[PDB]
JSON list of C-alpha atoms in Angstrom, two decimals:
[
{"chain": "A", "resi": 22, "resn": "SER", "atom": "CA", "xyz": [-23.44, -21.16, -0.59]},
{"chain": "A", "resi": 23, "resn": "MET", "atom": "CA", "xyz": [-21.50, -24.47, -0.62]},
{"chain": "A", "resi": 24, "resn": "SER", "atom": "CA", "xyz": [-21.60, -25.94, -4.15]},
{"chain": "A", "resi": 25, "resn": "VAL", "atom": "CA", "xyz": [-24.10, -23.09, -5.19]},
{"chain": "A", "resi": 26, "resn": "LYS", "atom": "CA", "xyz": [-22.61, -20.33, -7.27]},
{"chain": "A", "resi": 27, "resn": "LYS", "atom": "CA", "xyz": [-23.95, -17.42, -9.33]},
{"chain": "A", "resi": 28, "resn": "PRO", "atom": "CA", "xyz": [-22.63, -17.40, -12.92]},
{"chain": "A", "resi": 29, "resn": "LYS", "atom": "CA", "xyz": [-18.85, -16.35, -13.24]},
{"chain": "A", "resi": 30, "resn": "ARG", "atom": "CA", "xyz": [-18.60, -12.58, -14.24]},
{"chain": "A", "resi": 31, "resn": "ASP", "atom": "CA", "xyz": [-15.50, -12.24, -16.45]},
{"chain": "A", "resi": 32, "resn": "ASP", "atom": "CA", "xyz": [-12.88, -10.38, -14.34]},
{"chain": "A", "resi": 33, "resn": "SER", "atom": "CA", "xyz": [-9.82, -11.24, -16.51]},
{"chain": "A", "resi": 34, "resn": "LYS", "atom": "CA", "xyz": [-9.57, -7.71, -18.00]},
{"chain": "A", "resi": 35, "resn": "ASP", "atom": "CA", "xyz": [-10.17, -5.85, -14.71]},
{"chain": "A", "resi": 36, "resn": "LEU", "atom": "CA", "xyz": [-6.41, -5.14, -14.10]},
{"chain": "A", "resi": 37, "resn": "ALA", "atom": "CA", "xyz": [-5.96, -3.65, -17.58]},
{"chain": "A", "resi": 38, "resn": "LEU", "atom": "CA", "xyz": [-9.09, -1.67, -17.41]},
{"chain": "A", "resi": 39, "resn": "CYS", "atom": "CA", "xyz": [-8.36, -0.20, -13.87]},
{"chain": "A", "resi": 40, "resn": "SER", "atom": "CA", "xyz": [-4.85, 0.74, -15.23]},
{"chain": "A", "resi": 41, "resn": "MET", "atom": "CA", "xyz": [-6.51, 2.59, -18.17]},
{"chain": "A", "resi": 42, "resn": "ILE", "atom": "CA", "xyz": [-8.85, 4.47, -15.86]},
{"chain": "A", "resi": 43, "resn": "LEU", "atom": "CA", "xyz": [-5.96, 5.41, -13.57]},
{"chain": "A", "resi": 44, "resn": "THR", "atom": "CA", "xyz": [-3.98, 6.67, -16.62]},
{"chain": "A", "resi": 45, "resn": "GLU", "atom": "CA", "xyz": [-6.91, 8.90, -17.56]},
{"chain": "A", "resi": 46, "resn": "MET", "atom": "CA", "xyz": [-7.03, 10.24, -13.96]},
{"chain": "A", "resi": 47, "resn": "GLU", "atom": "CA", "xyz": [-3.20, 10.79, -13.96]},
{"chain": "A", "resi": 48, "resn": "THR", "atom": "CA", "xyz": [-3.40, 12.90, -17.09]},
{"chain": "A", "resi": 49, "resn": "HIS", "atom": "CA", "xyz": [-6.42, 15.03, -16.19]},
{"chain": "A", "resi": 50, "resn": "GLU", "atom": "CA", "xyz": [-5.45, 18.70, -15.86]},
{"chain": "A", "resi": 51, "resn": "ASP", "atom": "CA", "xyz": [-6.96, 18.85, -12.35]},
{"chain": "A", "resi": 52, "resn": "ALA", "atom": "CA", "xyz": [-5.00, 15.80, -11.06]},
{"chain": "A", "resi": 53, "resn": "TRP", "atom": "CA", "xyz": [-2.10, 17.91, -9.67]},
{"chain": "A", "resi": 54, "resn": "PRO", "atom": "CA", "xyz": [-3.24, 17.85, -6.01]},
{"chain": "A", "resi": 55, "resn": "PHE", "atom": "CA", "xyz": [-3.44, 14.03, -6.12]},
{"chain": "A", "resi": 56, "resn": "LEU", "atom": "CA", "xyz": [-0.39, 12.84, -8.09]},
{"chain": "A", "resi": 57, "resn": "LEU", "atom": "CA", "xyz": [1.93, 12.36, -5.13]},
{"chain": "A", "resi": 58, "resn": "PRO", "atom": "CA", "xyz": [1.56, 11.76, -1.41]},
{"chain": "A", "resi": 59, "resn": "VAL", "atom": "CA", "xyz": [0.90, 14.84, 0.70]},
{"chain": "A", "resi": 60, "resn": "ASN", "atom": "CA", "xyz": [4.22, 15.83, 2.38]},
{"chain": "A", "resi": 61, "resn": "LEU", "atom": "CA", "xyz": [3.49, 15.05, 6.03]},
{"chain": "A", "resi": 62, "resn": "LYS", "atom": "CA", "xyz": [6.49, 17.07, 7.23]},
{"chain": "A", "resi": 63, "resn": "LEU", "atom": "CA", "xyz": [5.41, 20.15, 5.33]},
{"chain": "A", "resi": 64, "resn": "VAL", "atom": "CA", "xyz": [1.64, 20.27, 5.68]},
{"chain": "A", "resi": 65, "resn": "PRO", "atom": "CA", "xyz": [0.47, 21.04, 9.21]},
{"chain": "A", "resi": 66, "resn": "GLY", "atom": "CA", "xyz": [-2.49, 19.04, 10.43]},
{"chain": "A", "resi": 67, "resn": "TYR", "atom": "CA", "xyz": [-2.42, 16.42, 7.68]},
{"chain": "A", "resi": 68, "resn": "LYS", "atom": "CA", "xyz": [-0.77, 13.63, 9.54]},
{"chain": "A", "resi": 69, "resn": "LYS", "atom": "CA", "xyz": [-3.12, 13.84, 12.51]},
{"chain": "A", "resi": 70, "resn": "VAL", "atom": "CA", "xyz": [-6.31, 14.49, 10.72]},
{"chain": "A", "resi": 71, "resn": "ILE", "atom": "CA", "xyz": [-6.13, 12.15, 7.68]},
{"chain": "A", "resi": 72, "resn": "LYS", "atom": "CA", "xyz": [-5.91, 8.71, 9.07]},
{"chain": "A", "resi": 73, "resn": "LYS", "atom": "CA", "xyz": [-5.36, 6.95, 5.71]},
{"chain": "A", "resi": 74, "resn": "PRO", "atom": "CA", "xyz": [-3.53, 9.09, 3.14]},
{"chain": "A", "resi": 75, "resn": "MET", "atom": "CA", "xyz": [-3.91, 8.01, -0.47]},
{"chain": "A", "resi": 76, "resn": "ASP", "atom": "CA", "xyz": [-2.72, 9.43, -3.83]},
{"chain": "A", "resi": 77, "resn": "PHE", "atom": "CA", "xyz": [-2.51, 8.36, -7.49]},
{"chain": "A", "resi": 78, "resn": "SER", "atom": "CA", "xyz": [1.13, 7.31, -7.37]},
{"chain": "A", "resi": 79, "resn": "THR", "atom": "CA", "xyz": [0.48, 5.06, -4.36]},
{"chain": "A", "resi": 80, "resn": "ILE", "atom": "CA", "xyz": [-2.55, 3.52, -6.15]},
{"chain": "A", "resi": 81, "resn": "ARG", "atom": "CA", "xyz": [-0.38, 3.01, -9.28]},
{"chain": "A", "resi": 82, "resn": "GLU", "atom": "CA", "xyz": [2.32, 1.21, -7.27]},
{"chain": "A", "resi": 83, "resn": "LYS", "atom": "CA", "xyz": [-0.30, -0.98, -5.46]},
{"chain": "A", "resi": 84, "resn": "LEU", "atom": "CA", "xyz": [-1.97, -1.78, -8.86]},
{"chain": "A", "resi": 85, "resn": "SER", "atom": "CA", "xyz": [1.36, -2.67, -10.49]},
{"chain": "A", "resi": 86, "resn": "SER", "atom": "CA", "xyz": [2.44, -5.04, -7.59]},
{"chain": "A", "resi": 87, "resn": "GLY", "atom": "CA", "xyz": [-0.78, -7.06, -7.12]},
{"chain": "A", "resi": 88, "resn": "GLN", "atom": "CA", "xyz": [-1.94, -5.46, -3.95]},
{"chain": "A", "resi": 89, "resn": "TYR", "atom": "CA", "xyz": [-5.59, -5.00, -5.11]},
{"chain": "A", "resi": 90, "resn": "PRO", "atom": "CA", "xyz": [-7.44, -8.29, -4.69]},
{"chain": "A", "resi": 91, "resn": "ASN", "atom": "CA", "xyz": [-10.33, -7.11, -6.85]},
{"chain": "A", "resi": 92, "resn": "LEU", "atom": "CA", "xyz": [-11.71, -4.08, -8.74]},
{"chain": "A", "resi": 93, "resn": "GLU", "atom": "CA", "xyz": [-13.73, -2.92, -5.63]},
{"chain": "A", "resi": 94, "resn": "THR", "atom": "CA", "xyz": [-10.63, -2.48, -3.47]},
{"chain": "A", "resi": 95, "resn": "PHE", "atom": "CA", "xyz": [-9.18, -0.34, -6.30]},
{"chain": "A", "resi": 96, "resn": "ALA", "atom": "CA", "xyz": [-12.31, 1.89, -6.35]},
{"chain": "A", "resi": 97, "resn": "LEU", "atom": "CA", "xyz": [-12.19, 2.22, -2.54]},
{"chain": "A", "resi": 98, "resn": "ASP", "atom": "CA", "xyz": [-8.62, 3.71, -2.70]},
{"chain": "A", "resi": 99, "resn": "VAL", "atom": "CA", "xyz": [-9.56, 6.07, -5.59]},
{"chain": "A", "resi": 100, "resn": "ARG", "atom": "CA", "xyz": [-12.61, 7.31, -3.53]},
{"chain": "A", "resi": 101, "resn": "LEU", "atom": "CA", "xyz": [-10.34, 7.65, -0.44]},
{"chain": "A", "resi": 102, "resn": "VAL", "atom": "CA", "xyz": [-8.26, 10.18, -2.35]},
{"chain": "A", "resi": 103, "resn": "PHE", "atom": "CA", "xyz": [-11.39, 12.32, -2.82]},
{"chain": "A", "resi": 104, "resn": "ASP", "atom": "CA", "xyz": [-12.80, 11.78, 0.58]},
{"chain": "A", "resi": 105, "resn": "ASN", "atom": "CA", "xyz": [-9.52, 12.88, 2.11]},
{"chain": "A", "resi": 106, "resn": "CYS", "atom": "CA", "xyz": [-9.51, 15.94, -0.11]},
{"chain": "A", "resi": 107, "resn": "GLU", "atom": "CA", "xyz": [-13.06, 16.98, 1.08]},
{"chain": "A", "resi": 108, "resn": "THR", "atom": "CA", "xyz": [-12.03, 16.40, 4.73]},
{"chain": "A", "resi": 109, "resn": "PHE", "atom": "CA", "xyz": [-9.07, 18.80, 4.49]},
{"chain": "A", "resi": 110, "resn": "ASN", "atom": "CA", "xyz": [-10.06, 21.35, 1.84]},
{"chain": "A", "resi": 111, "resn": "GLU", "atom": "CA", "xyz": [-12.82, 23.91, 1.57]},
{"chain": "A", "resi": 112, "resn": "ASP", "atom": "CA", "xyz": [-15.25, 23.33, -1.40]},
{"chain": "A", "resi": 113, "resn": "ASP", "atom": "CA", "xyz": [-14.50, 26.89, -2.59]},
{"chain": "A", "resi": 114, "resn": "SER", "atom": "CA", "xyz": [-10.72, 26.40, -3.05]},
{"chain": "A", "resi": 115, "resn": "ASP", "atom": "CA", "xyz": [-8.78, 25.34, -6.09]},
{"chain": "A", "resi": 116, "resn": "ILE", "atom": "CA", "xyz": [-7.95, 21.95, -4.48]},
{"chain": "A", "resi": 117, "resn": "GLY", "atom": "CA", "xyz": [-11.50, 21.47, -3.14]},
{"chain": "A", "resi": 118, "resn": "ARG", "atom": "CA", "xyz": [-12.93, 22.06, -6.66]},
{"chain": "A", "resi": 119, "resn": "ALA", "atom": "CA", "xyz": [-10.26, 19.78, -8.22]},
{"chain": "A", "resi": 120, "resn": "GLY", "atom": "CA", "xyz": [-11.41, 16.96, -5.97]},
{"chain": "A", "resi": 121, "resn": "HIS", "atom": "CA", "xyz": [-15.04, 17.30, -6.85]},
{"chain": "A", "resi": 122, "resn": "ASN", "atom": "CA", "xyz": [-14.20, 17.45, -10.54]},
{"chain": "A", "resi": 123, "resn": "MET", "atom": "CA", "xyz": [-11.94, 14.36, -10.36]},
{"chain": "A", "resi": 124, "resn": "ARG", "atom": "CA", "xyz": [-14.48, 12.34, -8.35]},
{"chain": "A", "resi": 125, "resn": "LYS", "atom": "CA", "xyz": [-17.09, 13.08, -11.04]},
{"chain": "A", "resi": 126, "resn": "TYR", "atom": "CA", "xyz": [-14.69, 12.16, -13.80]},
{"chain": "A", "resi": 127, "resn": "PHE", "atom": "CA", "xyz": [-13.82, 8.88, -12.06]},
{"chain": "A", "resi": 128, "resn": "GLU", "atom": "CA", "xyz": [-17.38, 7.82, -11.22]},
{"chain": "A", "resi": 129, "resn": "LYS", "atom": "CA", "xyz": [-18.43, 8.21, -14.88]},
{"chain": "A", "resi": 130, "resn": "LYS", "atom": "CA", "xyz": [-15.52, 6.16, -16.23]},
{"chain": "A", "resi": 131, "resn": "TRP", "atom": "CA", "xyz": [-16.23, 3.59, -13.52]},
{"chain": "A", "resi": 132, "resn": "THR", "atom": "CA", "xyz": [-19.95, 3.20, -14.54]},
{"chain": "A", "resi": 133, "resn": "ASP", "atom": "CA", "xyz": [-19.15, 3.28, -18.26]},
{"chain": "A", "resi": 134, "resn": "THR", "atom": "CA", "xyz": [-16.42, 0.62, -18.02]},
{"chain": "A", "resi": 135, "resn": "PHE", "atom": "CA", "xyz": [-18.00, -1.81, -15.50]},
{"chain": "A", "resi": 136, "resn": "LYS", "atom": "CA", "xyz": [-21.83, -1.13, -14.96]}
]
């Protein structure tokens, strides 16, 4: 509350560390569905159904331009990529499996780097 603060957690490396995680996600062999924004002109249903599209290149541009106020807003956009994927793709599809795999990969790096 006013004049009453928990001890300051060191957040000075968060930007570098989120960038490293994102690099690891960019280079994963199953990243291909997620590297670029879904082409809204060429994929029927996407525009209407997926209210907030997100992809790795969009996260990378937001990261690089100071548009994440803190490491939690970064994780929310990463998770959005996977949540969108599960909304639009059957579990038993190549893309559906890719999303599960990448979500797992991310959540481990997230815990190991920060928790």
